[PDB]
Design a protein around this ligand. Structure first.
Ligand SMILES: [N-]=[N+]=NC[C@H]1O[C@@H](n2c(SCCC(=O)O)nc3c(N)ncnc32)[C@H](O)[C@@H]1O
Length: 341
């Protein structure tokens, strides 16, 4: 088998002329030439079978991406693995080759307002479809937003996704490890398991802020720091918003803090479009029940040049609703059979 960086990257003969791209959350990512479609593609090598949690996340990603079909969500074009469960050690996921991602782009490129608007529209368009499937992405962040050379944007990595479960969202204070720290909504640290759609909107708000300045808006240095950053900008929650938190440990923590004034968005972002800042404010709303939902965000005046609900499709088949790694390997093997061979 062809090799890259000293490890097996076994994708031939259909895929040749491999180039190392990077180390992902799952393993090695390479580009390759697709001798059938006559185009270069991305290939991700995944080696999950020793660990139940890796098997979980891999099965999640495959099951969701195979059912979804949307312009702003990365597809799976092919899946390579051994013909038998016994011989299956790795799984390769073949996807459209994308020039960059928003994390890499923000490291060196200033975005025009037109690009910010276009990117945000595409994020919300993809998110509308995800949420219409009753699915939460739960790890939206710049590095999970792929971009091709013409700035078409695709949401990727559904390994942490879940079916929404609002009736079971409540929990205690300082539990819960949802999303990537900087993109984590304030209620995750207070009383939420991140089982409602508002968790994703918070992350999109954080992404919008980061597009406006090329800096993360809430750069918490560790888990506990993250709420400090959020409150340092939003200021102290109102009595009404505190009255919505019944958990006493969470509420009394907030009551124990000195008063903090809100920092006006236009002082943080003096060059930003005022309509973008109005939408930003509605996505970065402290109370998740008052936070804007994805279809309202699409209809916001900032996005008026793109908004078209008839061209913002929803899922045909929402997802309606412990396993040892052996059963998970068998499930991964079954889920990938359609690509044999
Ligand atoms: N990651 N990583 N590894 C490093 C490189 O992986 C690049 N990348 C991924 S990564 C998917 C998410 C993950 O697997 O974490 N998908 C693609 C892709 N379809 N086309 C081009 N490049 C891709 C990413 O920009 C990063 O530069």
């Amino acid at each position: 088998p062809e090799m890259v960086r000293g490890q097996v990257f076994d994708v031939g003969p259909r895929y040749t002329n491999l180039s190392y791209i990077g180390e992902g959350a799952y393993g090695m990512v390479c580009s390759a030439y697709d001798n059938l479609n006559k185009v270069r593609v991305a290939i991700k090598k995944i080696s999950p079978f020793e660990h139940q949690t890796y098997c979980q996340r891999t099965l999640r990603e495959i099951k969701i991406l195979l059912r979804f079909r949307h312009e702003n969500i990365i597809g799976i074009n092919d899946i390579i693995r051994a013909p038998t469960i016994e011989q299956m050690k790795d799984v390769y996921i073949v996807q459209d080759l994308m020039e960059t991602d928003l994390y890499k782009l923000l490291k060196t490129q200033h975005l025009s307002n037109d690009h910010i608007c276009y990117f945000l529209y595409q994020i919300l368009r993809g998110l509308k479809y995800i949420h219409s499937a009753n699915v939460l992405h739960r790890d939206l962040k710049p590095s999970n937003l792929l971009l091709n050379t013409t700035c078409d944007l695709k949401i990727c990595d559904f390994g942490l996704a879940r079916v929404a479960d609002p009736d079971h969202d409540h929990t205690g204070f300082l539990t819960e490890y949802v999303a990537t720290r900087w993109y984590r909504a304030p209620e995750i640290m207070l009383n939420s398991k991140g089982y409602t759609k508002s968790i994703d909107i918070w992350s999109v708000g954080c992404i919008l802020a980061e597009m406006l300045s090329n800096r993360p808006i809430f750069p918490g240095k560790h888990y506990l720091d993250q709420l400090n950053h959020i409150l340092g900008i939003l200021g102290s929650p109102s009595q009404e918003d505190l009255n919505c938190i019944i958990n006493l440990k969470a509420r009394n923590y907030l009551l124990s803090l000195p008063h903090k004034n809100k920092v006006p968005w236009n002082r943080l972002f003096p060059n930003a479009d005022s309509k973008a800042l109005d939408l930003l404010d509605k996505m970065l709303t402290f109370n998740p029940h008052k936070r804007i939902e994805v279809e309202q965000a699409l209809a916001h005046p900032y996005l008026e040049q793109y908004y078209d609900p008839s061209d913002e499709p929803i899922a045909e088949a929402p997802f309606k609703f412990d396993l040892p790694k052996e059963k998970l390997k068998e499930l991964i093997f079954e889920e990938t059979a359609r690509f044999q061979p």
